[PDB]
Amino acid sequence: GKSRESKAKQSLQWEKLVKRSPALAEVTLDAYERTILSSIVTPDEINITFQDIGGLDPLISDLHESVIYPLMMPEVYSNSPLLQAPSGVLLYGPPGCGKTMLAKALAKESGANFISIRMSSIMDKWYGESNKIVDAMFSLANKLQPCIIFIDQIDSFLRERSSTDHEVTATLKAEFMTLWDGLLNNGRVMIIGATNRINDIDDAFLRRLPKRFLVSLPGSDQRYKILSVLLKDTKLDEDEFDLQLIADNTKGFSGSDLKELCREAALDAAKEYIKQKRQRPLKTKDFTKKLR
Amino acid sequence: GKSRESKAKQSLQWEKLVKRSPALAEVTLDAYERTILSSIVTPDEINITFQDIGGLDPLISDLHESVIYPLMMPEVYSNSPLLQAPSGVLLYGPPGCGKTMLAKALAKESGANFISIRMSSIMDKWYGESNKIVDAMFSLANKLQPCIIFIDQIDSFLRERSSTDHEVTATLKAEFMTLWDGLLNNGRVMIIGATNRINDIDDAFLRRLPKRFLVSLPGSDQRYKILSVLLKDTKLDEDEFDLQLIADNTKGFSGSDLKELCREAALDAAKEYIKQKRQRPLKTKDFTKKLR
Amino acid sequence: SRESKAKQSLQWEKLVKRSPALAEVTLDAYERTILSSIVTPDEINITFQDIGGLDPLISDLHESVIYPLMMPEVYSNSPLLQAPSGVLLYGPPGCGKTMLAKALAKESGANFISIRMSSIMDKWYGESNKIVDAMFSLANKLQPCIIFIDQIDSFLRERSSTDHEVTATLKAEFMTLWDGLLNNGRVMIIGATNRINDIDDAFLRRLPKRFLVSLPGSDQRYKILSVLLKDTKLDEDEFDLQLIADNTKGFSGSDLKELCREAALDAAKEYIKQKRQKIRPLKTKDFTKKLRM
Amino acid sequence: GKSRESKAKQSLQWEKLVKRSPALAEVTLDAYERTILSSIVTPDEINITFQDIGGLDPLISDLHESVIYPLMMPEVYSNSPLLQAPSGVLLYGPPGCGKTMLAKALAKESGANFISIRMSSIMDKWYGESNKIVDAMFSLANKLQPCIIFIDQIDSFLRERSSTDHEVTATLKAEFMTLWDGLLNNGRVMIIGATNRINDIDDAFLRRLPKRFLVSLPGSDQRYKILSVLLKDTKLDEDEFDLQLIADNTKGFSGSDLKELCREAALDAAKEYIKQKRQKIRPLKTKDFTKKLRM
Amino acid sequence: SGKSRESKAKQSLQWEKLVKRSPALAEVTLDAYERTILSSIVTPDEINITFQDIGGLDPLISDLHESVIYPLMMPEVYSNSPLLQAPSGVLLYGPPGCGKTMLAKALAKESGANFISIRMSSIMDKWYGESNKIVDAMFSLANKLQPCIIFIDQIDSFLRERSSTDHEVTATLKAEFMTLWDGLLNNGRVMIIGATNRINDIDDAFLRRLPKRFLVSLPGSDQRYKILSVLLKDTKLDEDEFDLQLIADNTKGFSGSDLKELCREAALDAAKEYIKQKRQIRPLKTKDFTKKLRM
Amino acid sequence: SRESKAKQSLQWEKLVKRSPALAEVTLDAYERTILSSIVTPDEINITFQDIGGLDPLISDLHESVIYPLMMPEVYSNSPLLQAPSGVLLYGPPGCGKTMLAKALAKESGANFISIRMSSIMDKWYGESNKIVDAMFSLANKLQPCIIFIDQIDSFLRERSSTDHEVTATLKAEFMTLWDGLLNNGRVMIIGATNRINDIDDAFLRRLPKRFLVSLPGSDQRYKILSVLLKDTKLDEDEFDLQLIADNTKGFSGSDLKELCREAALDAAKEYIKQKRQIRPLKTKDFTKKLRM
Ligand SMILES: Nc1ncnc2c1ncn2[C@@H]1O[C@H](COP(=O)(O)OP(=O)(O)OP(=O)(O)O)[C@@H](O)[C@H]1O
Ligand SMILES: Nc1ncnc2c1ncn2[C@@H]1O[C@H](COP(=O)(O)OP(=O)(O)OP(=O)(O)O)[C@@H](O)[C@H]1O
Ligand SMILES: Nc1ncnc2c1ncn2[C@@H]1O[C@H](COP(=O)(O)OP(=O)(O)OP(=O)(O)O)[C@@H](O)[C@H]1O
Ligand SMILES: Nc1ncnc2c1ncn2[C@@H]1O[C@H](COP(=O)(O)OP(=O)(O)OP(=O)(O)O)[C@@H](O)[C@H]1O
Ligand SMILES: Nc1ncnc2c1ncn2[C@@H]1O[C@H](COP(=O)(O)OP(=O)(O)OP(=O)(O)O)[C@@H](O)[C@H]1O
Ligand SMILES: [Mg+2]
Ligand SMILES: [Mg+2]
Ligand SMILES: [Mg+2]
Ligand SMILES: [Mg+2]
Ligand SMILES: [Mg+2]
């Protein structure tokens, strides 16, 4: 971290990481390892928990029973070597499905050390430093034993390797595959991404993500569930309000669609509250006015 | 390089190598040689042996009798000047079929001093350091005479040279090409590489890897073999389990996909046991349920 | 590195024993650094007779390169008969450029500087340039000399504005000493490359003699297979090398060497297993089964 | 000497050392040994005690039992020869975490003779004078049998040797390695060093510092203890003031940062009192500390 | 080290100024290197800049006063709490030309502390170990002249982030500076004050030693108005045509030095006729500055 | 210095006690201040059997150094068996080189001159050359003599124009005096360096015999732990030394001494607390202090 504020952020992240577990006090880091630590996200920083995300009850339960307990509880799962947590985890679906919120909840509830690295922080201007950054990132995730590495926009980073791509990026991707699944066995390291398209991911990179969570468009019951959890603690009508009519009228709708519709429905009456304040339950009419 | 932890790791690996071969104690190493010494994998670090490999028995036997025995038994093969070890070995194939585990078994059981090198330790930002590091790698391999230098993801390291290549990468590849096969002949040093796109490798580098092993997608009997060696030391149903149906129904399944399928079957089979422990024999239904 | 200094002393002693006139020659520090890369004929295991399929190329290389350089009294009558200032061995990979390089290091008798870019490069400022200058000065001091740069398409790559300042200064210094105001003695630069087009034009000019080590023909491949299978037991009746040479279309010398090694291993696997507890004669089925045919 | 203040300080330090140890009056010193004696630090000069350090009580106790007591009392540990004091001690860690506070506590509370030699008194422009200075430093430490040679910022003095190093520096480092752990066995001399860049120290010098104390950035409980120690003999509010929150949100703050925060908090608390006095002190509050603090 | 007759005379003159400034300073004596440092001191007579000559930094000037100057110069007022003492170091960092050396000059003249404005050429020396002795004598002299502020202009170069590639004298010099700045021996009323543009260039251990940090940022609209009003003092201005407010709005992104140059160009263009008459004054107007301003 | 003169008289008296025929030898003032820095056997408390893990090196050092220097008649039959004029106990730090020097000082019986560079360099011009000349003259006069220069790498560093003129003429004088030492008297210069490469090659070739004291092996570390833990009470069953030896990867002799010291302190801290108002040493006390 060249910047002083980056160094301060690194110190804050390291102090919080030591606070979460004192077993990291004796662990000594490298310079690029501290640079990777700069992006480490702590559970207190994340606001979204697994209780916040709804409608994906089969997917949330699958995520729990196949990731959280296999990784954080090796004592329980140590009966066989096949019961370990997988090398990678994939989340794929259409845009606007709240996969980033799923990653936030997967960071928080688990309490696993989380690195939310990006393509920009990995690439460095000097020659050969992107590979060293990737190596120190994997070394840090090995040092922080119950750690999850998260990459958002994984389709760009795990993009298929061709002959027309930049040599720095191809070398970086090959180094990433070497450290991800190579001779040197990783610790309890799980790489996690959210992609709009699964075809963009390389087949070798698709191999390193053996479990894929289809964050599919919610079904009618699941649309109702997400409408309920994204209208929580919203001052609405007790008698007139009916979520099922909105769920039936919203066919082929994503989470972002319902989120923006609820946002507009709240704002149009917040305006009237401001108007009265210058000198509060809603109704169906706001929701169904948008519906046609 | 000059880091305290890296120096301790280099001393540990050198002590392990001296323990493996008492004759190695009297040899001397340069500073760059000590630097590349940190990339050496000792047999104890690898948890995968040759017998953990299934479905590649013809490949295992051919690789032994054509790669390991000519290299590690030179007195036996010294009867003819055409029985030496190949100057290079390429393990290429579709992802999952086990090239990395081939290299793991070679690191554990061949008895050769292994050098698992990634690109990050090779590339250096300073001018002329990467070429000296490659020269030191080859000199160290020559000094530890039955050595193996393994480059996972060798396609990016040995890509087809172009005018658009970075100068340091191009000079790096040319220096590697020179030391690999030049006037100053190497000892019993062999470069083993792993890749998926064999055509991505340079033609003059594919020449230096003559003994190429096509680790292709396993067949039905092969897939039965990986399913059997994956499900060892695990409780199975005596009558209900029918692994032949699982092997036949896993159409187009790589080794890693097979491992993930086995792990998922074990998880849904032992969910109840894990729930009981937090406060189940495997059957055909567990495997076929995750199978599609 | 003490190994480097010991190597320099050993090669200097070898060159002094080879040429008594070299004893009184004094060298600078960077000259000794280059002297670390001197290749003596004792380090090369291969003579010119082991290169087969290039006999016209070998003879022409001799008459145009080795004889005009090693014996200047024979060619001194006419000034046009001077040995070339550079030689390029370009072609497809595996056809035998380093074969001729090792043979020139062994049998020509010229002092050999098989330099690599690891020795030429230096992290400190103004050190790579002085290393190249001392390389040329040392080659001038060891008056019949051959400087070899394997994979020369990288050292002498086409110059661009994106090139590093130290490497641009390096290539310019190489150009200046290669053919500048102060002409060299009997110093000839020899290079090998897979990509001749990547070499700079101002360097391709400085390599006037160009040997195209092309892909071997049928008779050439027969010569390579006869050379590689020398001192190896062959079947008098079954084994016929002409069929094998004809069948191996588009095979370089390295591919033929790998075919010979694999065939010998397949033939002698039973001998190997007996040793684990004579060599079987090599047959045409043994070679042809491995080959695609 | 070559300076009136230097000679006066030499005489004063020698008198203090003679008063501390009556048997030291019979010991004669060389001119270079007197120049080293000019750098003797007595406890009366140091104002920090071990009680003035907070958040390092496990480290303070470990340092005591492994360094101070094995050196100060050898009769308790003399039942076995393996209980002797370490030859060197390295206090390494990020800056501002209390390494020189521990050094001051070692100077005052431990009771060992303390030399806080600086790199100016060691280096000399002449030939061989620096090496004679180092040799006399080690001889003086041996004469003052329970000595501690403290060298603040030992990373620069004991940096990795190289050909680029001046010949006097390389000769100096070789002389230090010879006297420190070489053919002649030292007395109860311990070389205590503080640094921020442990990796800069030579490996051959690092082996001569076998006891290593890592003074890292303070934790939340450590920050609370440090703030409680720093805010002693102050007027604090009985109900408004609460140190726990303030220790909580000062993430990544070293001891120096906490001292600065307390300093500016005291200044802005008393600002009205100074305004009155220039023409009592307001008790400190949590809003006062968190106003200067950036949260 | 190296001394000259003119340098000796300058040191003698500075010593006379110090003795006249404080009678108790006459009884102390100095070393040769202390006298060398004496040449780098600054008296209020040599400075023509007052704290009233700085515009736009009035809250920063008041904060600097209350947190820096008053605790250092009247410890009797602040002696009720030990946490009221002056900071060990103060960093004046910001974009270039914003007024850091203006603040330092006003500090040297109006605060009244013995000011040592040291430059990098007086510290470095080719001879071995002379830089460390120069720094040691600098700190000893600053302790001798008890209220003392040591100014290192462009302190980023002196206190740059240490690395293994640093010269042995540079690294030893910086380690000696860190040892004396805050080490075993507590400094007296000595404060090291440094101006810089590259705060990020400074090592973390040095930034630890400069806890009070002042950001002299680029001036705002009101700040630019105050700077222009200060610069245009004792210069005739048009009663009606001049409008400093509009000028202040249009000079966006200007530092104090840029505004000084704008005023210089405007004044020269105004007085060109007067200079033509003198070779063989018009009051300043808005168009004078506007013809140069590039809004 | 009066103390220096007292030390000189004490050393000369001890030498006269060691060799009765040595009383006749006359001294110069430079020879006296050289004599001030020599070491007698009683000052050394380290004996050859106090060094563990170096018994092959102990025997080689004996047969090539101790006997040829002490018994010249026996080994004068072949010039190869004669004592070399230069011995270099080089190796990694903390492996026993200066302990080997201490044992050579105490057990040889040869007059050991352990000089330091503080006694050789001098500010006055020409005094250092007289010091070195008197050193070699005293080595001549004390007929069995070993000039031990601890850290000879700094003395014998590569000559450069940046070095002082006095340093250059000192190195020239030392080369002049060192050459001709073969077959003229029995004087051998013993050096001990961490970094052999720092030695100037012209001075390096004056040391033909080289002893590599490398990092100890597992068996050597077991022997070192056995030697260090002598006259110390150990548990009969709970204490196994081979576990400590195998767990101390890359540990030098100094590091092993520190580990034993801290383990003994940790085990005896309860007895120390009782005394201020000994437990047998066990494997657990080592392993809690040790890192696995
Ligand atoms: N022959 C085999 N025997 C047993 N298990 C196998 C075999 N091949 C693959 N596997 C299983 O599949 C996984 C394959 O991982 P491996 O590291 O071999 O893939 P890879 O070679 O890195 O793939 P890629 O081509 O994407 O680089 C292993 O974890 C292993 O459990
Ligand atoms: N003309 C030849 N005669 C005999 N053997 C040959 C010939 N050409 C190649 N070979 C065999 O092939 C092997 C490799 O040849 P060589 O090393 O000359 O290729 P190369 O020129 O280095 O390839 P590249 O052009 O990629 O650098 C040699 O060991 C040699 O045994
Ligand atoms: N553990 C602590 N307990 C109480 N106060 C502390 C502690 N650590 C630091 N401080 C306060 O912070 C200031 C830091 O001074 P200190 O001597 O620790 O710095 P230093 O160790 O010299 O710096 P460096 O780490 O760069 O050598 C001290 O004045 C002290 O008041
Ligand atoms: N706040 C201000 N009020 C009035 N004039 C100012 C102010 N700041 C700067 N100036 C004018 O700008 C000129 C330069 O300011 P100063 O010398 O403080 O910059 P500096 O801090 O030395 O810059 P650098 O960062 O490049 O060292 C001064 O002569 C002054 O006239
Ligand atoms: N081979 C060994 N056998 C027994 N004890 C050893 C051995 N090596 C080291 N030790 C112990 O560790 C300590 C190491 O100090 P020693 O003087 O041997 O190091 P050194 O030779 O000075 O190393 P360097 O010169 O590289 O600093 C010794 O006091 C000794 O007690
Ligand atoms: Mg792979
Ligand atoms: Mg070639
Ligand atoms: Mg300090
Ligand atoms: Mg300035
Ligand atoms: Mg030693």
mmCIF file of C-alpha atoms in Angstrom, chain C residues 23-205:
data_model
loop_
_atom_site.group_PDB
_atom_site.id
_atom_site.type_symbol
_atom_site.label_atom_id
_atom_site.label_comp_id
_atom_site.label_asym_id
_atom_site.label_seq_id
_atom_site.Cartn_x
_atom_site.Cartn_y
_atom_site.Cartn_z
ATOM 1 C CA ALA C 23 49.289 -16.014 -21.393
ATOM 2 C CA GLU C 24 50.616 -12.444 -21.598
ATOM 3 C CA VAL C 25 47.172 -11.005 -22.413
ATOM 4 C CA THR C 26 45.710 -8.912 -19.591
ATOM 5 C CA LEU C 27 41.976 -8.736 -18.914
ATOM 6 C CA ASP C 28 39.750 -6.243 -17.118
ATOM 7 C CA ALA C 29 37.029 -7.098 -14.603
ATOM 8 C CA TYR C 30 34.150 -7.160 -17.087
ATOM 9 C CA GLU C 31 36.410 -9.067 -19.478
ATOM 10 C CA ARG C 32 36.693 -11.792 -16.831
ATOM 11 C CA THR C 33 32.923 -11.610 -16.317
ATOM 12 C CA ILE C 34 32.561 -12.418 -20.019
ATOM 13 C CA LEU C 35 35.323 -15.046 -19.712
ATOM 14 C CA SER C 36 32.960 -16.862 -17.356
ATOM 15 C CA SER C 37 30.950 -17.686 -20.513
ATOM 16 C CA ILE C 38 33.880 -19.068 -22.531
ATOM 17 C CA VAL C 39 33.115 -22.531 -23.922
ATOM 18 C CA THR C 40 36.141 -24.784 -24.358
ATOM 19 C CA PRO C 41 36.148 -27.797 -26.715
ATOM 20 C CA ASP C 42 36.363 -30.097 -23.678
ATOM 21 C CA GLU C 43 32.819 -29.138 -22.612
ATOM 22 C CA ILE C 44 31.198 -30.170 -25.919
ATOM 23 C CA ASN C 45 30.522 -33.887 -26.325
ATOM 24 C CA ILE C 46 29.690 -33.743 -30.038
ATOM 25 C CA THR C 47 31.861 -33.558 -33.166
ATOM 26 C CA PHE C 48 30.852 -32.564 -36.708
ATOM 27 C CA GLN C 49 30.409 -36.224 -37.719
ATOM 28 C CA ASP C 50 27.349 -36.526 -35.440
ATOM 29 C CA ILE C 51 25.396 -33.984 -37.465
ATOM 30 C CA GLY C 52 23.776 -35.854 -40.337
ATOM 31 C CA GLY C 53 21.555 -34.600 -43.132
ATOM 32 C CA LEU C 54 23.416 -31.273 -43.277
ATOM 33 C CA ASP C 55 26.537 -32.436 -45.127
ATOM 34 C CA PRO C 56 26.328 -29.814 -47.936
ATOM 35 C CA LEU C 57 25.496 -27.216 -45.285
ATOM 36 C CA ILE C 58 28.404 -28.411 -43.125
ATOM 37 C CA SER C 59 30.847 -28.296 -46.050
ATOM 38 C CA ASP C 60 29.697 -24.834 -47.151
ATOM 39 C CA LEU C 61 29.851 -23.599 -43.547
ATOM 40 C CA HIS C 62 33.406 -24.932 -43.334
ATOM 41 C CA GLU C 63 34.623 -23.407 -46.606
ATOM 42 C CA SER C 64 32.938 -20.037 -46.006
ATOM 43 C CA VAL C 65 33.347 -19.623 -42.243
ATOM 44 C CA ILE C 66 35.873 -21.863 -40.525
ATOM 45 C CA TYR C 67 38.662 -21.981 -43.100
ATOM 46 C CA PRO C 68 38.537 -18.206 -43.877
ATOM 47 C CA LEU C 69 38.726 -17.536 -40.130
ATOM 48 C CA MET C 70 41.088 -20.193 -38.778
ATOM 49 C CA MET C 71 43.669 -20.077 -41.577
ATOM 50 C CA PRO C 72 44.051 -16.487 -42.838
ATOM 51 C CA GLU C 73 47.317 -17.156 -44.690
ATOM 52 C CA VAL C 74 45.429 -19.270 -47.238
ATOM 53 C CA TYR C 75 42.918 -16.490 -47.973
ATOM 54 C CA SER C 76 45.244 -13.505 -47.435
ATOM 55 C CA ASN C 77 46.066 -13.151 -51.149
ATOM 56 C CA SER C 78 42.684 -11.550 -51.895
ATOM 57 C CA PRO C 79 40.984 -9.155 -49.443
ATOM 58 C CA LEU C 80 37.516 -10.322 -50.537
ATOM 59 C CA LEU C 81 38.216 -13.799 -49.102
ATOM 60 C CA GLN C 82 37.867 -12.542 -45.518
ATOM 61 C CA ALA C 83 35.683 -14.468 -43.086
ATOM 62 C CA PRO C 84 32.237 -12.923 -42.523
ATOM 63 C CA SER C 85 31.650 -10.554 -39.633
ATOM 64 C CA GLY C 86 28.493 -12.476 -38.722
ATOM 65 C CA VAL C 87 26.718 -15.778 -39.256
ATOM 66 C CA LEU C 88 23.044 -16.593 -38.695
ATOM 67 C CA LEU C 89 21.696 -20.133 -38.334
ATOM 68 C CA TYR C 90 17.957 -19.632 -38.799
ATOM 69 C CA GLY C 91 15.246 -22.163 -39.524
ATOM 70 C CA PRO C 92 12.437 -24.242 -38.066
ATOM 71 C CA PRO C 93 12.983 -25.491 -34.505
ATOM 72 C CA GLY C 94 14.831 -28.767 -34.049
ATOM 73 C CA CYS C 95 16.557 -28.905 -37.427
ATOM 74 C CA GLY C 96 20.046 -28.658 -35.927
ATOM 75 C CA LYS C 97 21.177 -25.068 -35.390
ATOM 76 C CA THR C 98 22.601 -25.796 -31.940
ATOM 77 C CA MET C 99 24.022 -28.977 -33.472
ATOM 78 C CA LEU C 100 26.211 -26.849 -35.740
ATOM 79 C CA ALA C 101 26.816 -24.463 -32.837
ATOM 80 C CA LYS C 102 28.246 -27.211 -30.626
ATOM 81 C CA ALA C 103 30.241 -28.553 -33.571
ATOM 82 C CA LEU C 104 31.700 -25.086 -34.186
ATOM 83 C CA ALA C 105 32.572 -24.848 -30.495
ATOM 84 C CA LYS C 106 34.263 -28.262 -30.608
ATOM 85 C CA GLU C 107 35.972 -28.753 -33.979
ATOM 86 C CA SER C 108 36.525 -25.304 -35.514
ATOM 87 C CA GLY C 109 39.260 -24.369 -33.052
ATOM 88 C CA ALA C 110 38.033 -20.799 -32.626
ATOM 89 C CA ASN C 111 37.685 -19.598 -29.051
ATOM 90 C CA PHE C 112 33.989 -19.714 -28.223
ATOM 91 C CA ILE C 113 31.966 -17.199 -26.215
ATOM 92 C CA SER C 114 28.531 -18.768 -25.764
ATOM 93 C CA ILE C 115 27.029 -15.714 -24.114
ATOM 94 C CA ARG C 116 23.503 -15.517 -22.712
ATOM 95 C CA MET C 117 21.363 -12.538 -21.805
ATOM 96 C CA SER C 118 21.586 -13.306 -18.079
ATOM 97 C CA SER C 119 25.280 -12.409 -18.153
ATOM 98 C CA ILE C 120 24.768 -9.461 -20.521
ATOM 99 C CA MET C 121 22.000 -7.834 -18.471
ATOM 100 C CA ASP C 122 22.885 -6.064 -15.241
ATOM 101 C CA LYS C 123 20.683 -4.207 -12.778
ATOM 102 C CA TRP C 124 23.237 -1.462 -12.135
ATOM 103 C CA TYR C 125 23.434 1.551 -14.413
ATOM 104 C CA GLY C 126 25.909 1.462 -17.269
ATOM 105 C CA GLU C 127 26.983 -2.108 -16.529
ATOM 106 C CA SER C 128 25.295 -3.967 -19.388
ATOM 107 C CA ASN C 129 26.957 -1.612 -21.875
ATOM 108 C CA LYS C 130 30.385 -2.140 -20.321
ATOM 109 C CA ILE C 131 29.743 -5.896 -20.264
ATOM 110 C CA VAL C 132 29.039 -5.885 -24.020
ATOM 111 C CA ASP C 133 32.073 -3.666 -24.651
ATOM 112 C CA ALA C 134 34.272 -6.026 -22.643
ATOM 113 C CA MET C 135 32.799 -8.999 -24.500
ATOM 114 C CA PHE C 136 33.900 -7.500 -27.803
ATOM 115 C CA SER C 137 37.278 -6.438 -26.391
ATOM 116 C CA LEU C 138 37.924 -9.937 -25.014
ATOM 117 C CA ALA C 139 36.914 -11.486 -28.338
ATOM 118 C CA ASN C 140 39.372 -9.130 -30.035
ATOM 119 C CA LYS C 141 42.067 -10.195 -27.560
ATOM 120 C CA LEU C 142 41.404 -13.886 -28.271
ATOM 121 C CA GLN C 143 41.923 -12.953 -31.913
ATOM 122 C CA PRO C 144 40.263 -15.982 -33.611
ATOM 123 C CA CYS C 145 36.966 -15.921 -31.744
ATOM 124 C CA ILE C 146 33.307 -16.791 -32.199
ATOM 125 C CA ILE C 147 30.672 -15.108 -30.041
ATOM 126 C CA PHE C 148 27.499 -17.197 -29.958
ATOM 127 C CA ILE C 149 24.096 -15.809 -28.975
ATOM 128 C CA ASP C 150 21.509 -18.580 -28.878
ATOM 129 C CA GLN C 151 17.921 -17.454 -29.499
ATOM 130 C CA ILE C 152 19.275 -14.283 -31.081
ATOM 131 C CA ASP C 153 15.789 -13.059 -32.026
ATOM 132 C CA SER C 154 15.526 -11.611 -28.489
ATOM 133 C CA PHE C 155 18.941 -9.983 -28.028
ATOM 134 C CA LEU C 156 18.734 -8.446 -31.512
ATOM 135 C CA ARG C 157 14.978 -7.915 -31.652
ATOM 136 C CA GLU C 158 13.526 -5.138 -33.791
ATOM 137 C CA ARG C 159 14.066 -1.887 -31.923
ATOM 138 C CA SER C 160 11.012 0.082 -30.847
ATOM 139 C CA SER C 161 10.315 3.242 -28.883
ATOM 140 C CA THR C 162 8.761 1.088 -26.145
ATOM 141 C CA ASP C 163 12.105 -0.646 -25.538
ATOM 142 C CA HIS C 164 13.877 -0.101 -22.238
ATOM 143 C CA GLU C 165 16.548 2.587 -22.180
ATOM 144 C CA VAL C 166 19.236 0.186 -20.952
ATOM 145 C CA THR C 167 18.431 -2.378 -23.640
ATOM 146 C CA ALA C 168 18.327 0.273 -26.376
ATOM 147 C CA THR C 169 21.742 1.485 -25.244
ATOM 148 C CA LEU C 170 22.817 -2.174 -25.153
ATOM 149 C CA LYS C 171 21.715 -2.919 -28.714
ATOM 150 C CA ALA C 172 23.259 0.324 -29.972
ATOM 151 C CA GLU C 173 26.559 -0.548 -28.283
ATOM 152 C CA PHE C 174 26.402 -4.009 -29.858
ATOM 153 C CA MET C 175 25.846 -2.364 -33.252
ATOM 154 C CA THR C 176 28.719 0.073 -32.725
ATOM 155 C CA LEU C 177 31.227 -2.596 -31.726
ATOM 156 C CA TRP C 178 29.967 -5.149 -34.263
ATOM 157 C CA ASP C 179 30.672 -2.873 -37.237
ATOM 158 C CA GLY C 180 31.815 0.640 -36.351
ATOM 159 C CA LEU C 181 34.871 2.827 -36.730
ATOM 160 C CA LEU C 182 37.270 0.463 -34.948
ATOM 161 C CA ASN C 183 36.959 -2.765 -36.910
ATOM 162 C CA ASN C 184 37.333 -6.037 -35.034
ATOM 163 C CA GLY C 185 39.979 -8.676 -35.616
ATOM 164 C CA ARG C 186 38.995 -12.211 -36.591
ATOM 165 C CA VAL C 187 35.852 -12.000 -34.451
ATOM 166 C CA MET C 188 32.640 -13.436 -35.869
ATOM 167 C CA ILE C 189 29.220 -13.322 -34.225
ATOM 168 C CA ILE C 190 27.181 -16.493 -34.743
ATOM 169 C CA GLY C 191 23.503 -16.681 -33.875
ATOM 170 C CA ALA C 192 20.661 -19.169 -33.932
ATOM 171 C CA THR C 193 16.973 -18.319 -34.042
ATOM 172 C CA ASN C 194 13.563 -19.766 -34.793
ATOM 173 C CA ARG C 195 12.178 -16.383 -35.912
ATOM 174 C CA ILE C 196 14.539 -14.658 -38.338
ATOM 175 C CA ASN C 197 11.928 -11.963 -39.018
ATOM 176 C CA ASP C 198 12.115 -10.770 -35.401
ATOM 177 C CA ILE C 199 15.780 -9.777 -35.767
ATOM 178 C CA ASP C 200 16.424 -6.102 -36.464
ATOM 179 C CA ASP C 201 17.364 -5.102 -39.997
ATOM 180 C CA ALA C 202 20.483 -3.286 -38.797
ATOM 181 C CA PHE C 203 21.476 -6.554 -37.075
ATOM 182 C CA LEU C 204 20.383 -8.847 -39.915
ATOM 183 C CA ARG C 205 22.719 -6.767 -42.068
#
